[PDB]
Symmetry: C3
Subunit: 339 residues, 3 copies
C-alpha cells in the first residue's frame, strides 16, 4: 500500500495477519511445537530519487506475536526483523547498514520457500546465515552493468557483544556471487568472523573464528520452483544439549536442503522438501543430527492478498538423538491476510 508518491519519494506501508496453529503429539518432543502460533507483521519500505544516478532507500519491519497473553508473556517473540537504510548509485552498486540478512542467506534463500517451515539452517543472530544486526552490505547487480545476470556482494559484519553467547558475534567479512540465466540461478556465498570470548567460553564449540559457506541452484520458471542448497559451518551453528542442559556451537555442520514446488494457475501450490543438517566433533557427543525431515505441504492462493496453507513435517530425527532434538512430526495450518 503506497501511502506516498511525490517528487520521486515513494513509501509503501505493508503488513499481514497470520492465523496459525501447530499440531504435534501431546509437543515438547516435536519438530515445531504444539498450539497457537498466530502473529502479525508491520513495516514500511521507502525509496527516494536524489538525482538521476543516485537513489536512497530505507526499510523497517516488526514482528508482533499474537499467541501471547496480556500478562507477563505479552511481548514474547516480538522483535525487529529488518531495519536499515542505504544508497544505490547508477551502476556502481548499493550500500546499506542496519539489521539485514547475512550474505550467506544469499545462498540459503534459494530453499527458504516452504509454506511455514524450512530454512532451518538460516538462524537469526548467527553471523551470516539469517537476520543479523549491524551489517554493512555492498551489492552489485549485472556486474557494474557489464554482465547481465551476474551479481555479487560483500558484507562487513560488525561485532555485537551481547549478554548471551547464542546472540553474539565478532568482526567479520563475507561475500557472495550469483549468476541467473534462462530460468536458472547459481550462487555461492562465504563468511568468516571472530567468536567473542563469551562464545569461546562455552562448553560446546572450540575455535577462535566462525565460518559459514553455502552454494545453491534453483529453477524458477514455468510455474515450477526447484532448489538445492549445500552448506558447511565451523564453530557457527547454535546447538543445545537438552540432556546436560548445556549450550554452544557445533564445531562443524554439514547442511542439505532441497525443495520442489509447482504453482497451479488456480492458486494451489503443492510442495515437497528435504532438510538434513549433521553436527560433527561435538564435545561429549561426537556426531549427531540436528535436522532431518521430509516435508509435504501446499498453499492455496486465493489472490495477492489471501492464502491458506498446510505444512506437514515427516520428522526423521530419532527418539534416541544424543542432543535431545525432538523426533515427533508437526503439522501447521495457516490463514494469511496481507496487504
Amino acid at each position: 500500500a503506497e501511502i506516498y508518491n511525490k517528487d520521486g519519494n515513494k513509501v509503501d506501508l505493508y503488513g499481514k495477519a497470520v492465523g496459525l496453529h501447530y499440531f504435534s503429539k501431546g509437543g515438547e518432543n516435536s519438530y515445531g511445537g504444539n498450539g497457537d502460533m498466530t502473529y502479525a507483521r508491520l513495516g514500511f519500505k521507502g525509496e527516494t530519487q536524489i538525482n538521476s544516478d543516485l537513489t536512497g532507500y530505507g526499510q523497517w519491519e516488526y514482528n508482533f506475536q499474537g499467541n501471547n497473553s496480556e500478562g507477563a508473556d505479552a511481548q514474547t517473540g516480538n522483535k525487529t526483523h529488518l531495519a536499515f537504510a542505504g544508497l544505490k548509485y547508477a551502476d556502481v552498486g548499493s550500500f546499506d547498514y542496519g539489521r539485514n540478512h547475512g550474505v550467506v542467506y544469499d545462498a540459503l534463500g534459494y530453499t527458504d520457500m516452504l509454506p511455514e517451515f524450512g530454512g532451518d539452517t538460516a538462524y537469526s543472530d548467527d553471523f551470516f546465515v539469517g537476520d543479523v544486526g549491524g551489517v554493512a552490505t555492498y551489492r552489485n547487480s549485472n556486474f557494474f552493468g557489464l554482465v547481465d545476470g551476474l551479481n555479487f556482494a560483500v558484507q562487513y559484519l560488525g561485532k555485537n557483544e551481547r549478554d548471551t553467547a547464542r546472540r553474539s558475534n565478532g568482526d567479520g567479512v563475507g561475500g557472495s556471487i550469483s549468476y541467473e540465466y534462462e530460468g536458472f540461478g547459481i550462487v555461492g556465498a562465504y563468511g568468516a568472523a571472530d567468536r567473542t570470548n563469551l562464545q569461546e567460553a562455552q562448553p560446546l564449540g572450540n575455535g577462535k573464528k566462525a565460518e559459514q559457506w553455502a552454494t545453491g541452484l534453483k529453477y524458477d520458471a514455468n510455474n515450477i520452483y526447484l532448489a538445492a542448497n549445500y552448506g558447511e559451518t565451523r564453530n557457527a551453528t547454535p546447538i543445545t544439549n537438552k540432556f546436560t542442559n548445556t549450550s554452544g556451537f557445533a564445531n562443524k555442520t554439514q547442511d542439505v536442503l532441497l525443495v520442489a514446488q509447482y504453482q497451479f494457475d488456480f492458486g494451489l501450490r503443492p510442495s515437497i522438501a528435504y532438510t538434513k543438517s549433521k553436527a560433527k566433533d561435538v564435545e561429549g557427543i561426537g556426531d549427531v543430527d540436528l535436522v532431518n525431515y521430509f516435508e509435504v505441504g501446499a498453499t492455496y492462493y486465493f489472490n495477492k492478498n489471501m492464502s491458506t496453507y498446510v505444512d506437514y513435517i515427516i520428522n526423521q530425527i530419532d527418539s534416541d538423538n544424543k542432543l535431545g532434538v525432538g523426533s515427533d512430526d508437526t503439522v501447521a495450518v495457516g490463514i494469511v491476510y496481507q496487504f
Copy 2:
C-alpha cells in the same frame, strides 16, 4: 483511514491517542488505581473480494501504553489486542482464527459501553468472556439469509498452556445466538472448556472444566442506549486473595451489568451503570463480592475524531472485603484523538 482501495482489496489504517488520568485517594485500595493511564492504539483492517460470493479479511491491533518510563518498565501493558484472519462466504457464514473475542463476549458486549470503565467480567485470557488467543470462530448472520436479525456463532477454543494459571486454558467449545428487531437485541451465549493441570493445581478453584454463560438485552435507537447482562461462571473467573497472597479461579460467580445512556445531538452523552459480581464457594472464604459499584459519567463527542470524558465509579465494595478487593472510588478523565 483507507490507505488502499483497488481491485476489491481495501485496507484501513486506524489508531487513537488517549490522554487519561485516574484519581483515587492516596490508590492501592481503589477500584481503578491512581495516576496517569495514557495509552495509544494502532491497527489495520483488510477485506479482499476473492470472487462474487467469497471475501477474505484480516485485522490486527496493538496497545502501546504511554504511562510508562523509558527504562525497565517501558513495555508494561503493551500487548496485541486482536490478530486474526478469515473468510466469509455468501450466505454460508464466516470463519476466522487468531486472537479474537470469546463468544460469550457476544453477550457481554451489550453492557461494555461506559466511557472508561465497565465490562468488568469480560476478562482477557479467560476462556470465552474477552480477548483470548487461539480461537476459531464460525459466524452466521441472518440465519443463512433466511431470517433477518437472527445470528449465531460457534467457537472452538484451542488449549493455551502458559507459564501462569491465570492466562491458560484447555480445549473448549462455545456458541451464541442473537436476535435483533425494531431497535432491540436479545442474545445468549455459552462455553465450556478443560482447565489445565496448572489451573487445577491452584488453591482457589476446584473442577475439571470451566464454564461461562450469559444472556443480555439491549435497546439502541432514538439516541438511547440501555442494556442488561446476566452471567454465571464455574471455575472460570480469575480471583486473588490479597490477604493470603494466593490466586486462582472462583468456583462460581453470578454477574449483573446494567447500563443506561442518552446521546444528545450536540455531542454530550451522559451515562449511568451498575455492576455486581459475587463469588461463591471460594476455598477459605465462602462467598464474597468481586465487583459492586454504580457508575455516573459522560462523554463529549466534538466529532468523529475527538472526544472528552469523565467517568465516576461510586464503589460499593466494602472496606472489610474478604479477598482484599479495593473499596475506594475512582474518577477517570480522558481526552481522545482517533482516526
Copy 3:
C-alpha cells in the same frame, strides 16, 4: 505522509530508519558506547477542525531499537516517545495531556540540534527537562494574538510513583516564556516538584523538592544556527556512582550548552558544540563533572528524505572522574531514511 484529508481531519503517518554505528576504544569507558545503534521510529499526527475557532489534535510516536537480537534482549530500548491529545482554541491557547516534553525543554530544545549527540541534560523521566509521562500543558502563542513572537506555557506535572527512583516524580508545576524577533529567540523556563519518598530514600540527593530552570538564546536565519543554554538543577539530575555502585540525584548541577552550525545550499551542514554540566554537594564526592566535551560533526542532507552524518565527541571528562563517568571519545556514523 498524509493518509487522510477530508472534512477538516488530516492524519500524517511518519517514520524513519536510522542505520547507526558508534566507535569508541575497546567501550565501557567512553562517552557514548561502542557498536551498533540502529533504530527506527513510527508515529502519527492528527488535527481535526471541530469548529472555526476550535481544533483538536493527537500525536503518538514509538521507538523500536534495531540493534537487539531476537532473544531475551529483543525489546531493549523500545518505548513510547510521545503520546498525547489536546485542544487548541482560537486565541485562548491550547491544552494537552499525555507523554510530552517537560516545559524546561522549551529552553533546552535550543541547543538539542547536533547530528547524533547533545541535549545531554534533557533527561527522560526527569521532571521537566525531557520526555515525561503525565504532563498537562497549557500553551499560548503570540500572547492571545496581542503580541507577535511572545509565547508562554504552564505545565502541571502529575506524580508518577514508579518502581525505581530514577523514573519517578511527584506533583509539580512549571512554566516558560519565549520571545522571537527578526531571526532571534530568547526563552526562560522553570519548574518545581515534589520528590517521592523513594527518591528521598536514595543515598545521592537530599531534599523534599526538585527544581530545574534554564534560559537560552538562539539565532536561526541566513543558513546559520547558533544557540546557548544555561541551566541549574537542585535534587533533580540523575547520577550514578560507578565506584560504589550507588545511584540518586545531584544536589545541584550547573549546565552550559553551546552550538554553532551552518547549512550549505548543497546539503552539507557542519557543526561545533560544547557541553559542560557540573555536579555539586554530592554525598561522598562533593563536586564532580557529569558532562564535559567539545563536538565536531556534520550532516549531509541529500534531500527531505535522506541524510548521512558523522558526529565526533572530543571527551574532556578525565580518567580519574570521581563518579566513574567515562572519559573516552566517541564517533557516530549514521544514515537516515525518513518519510
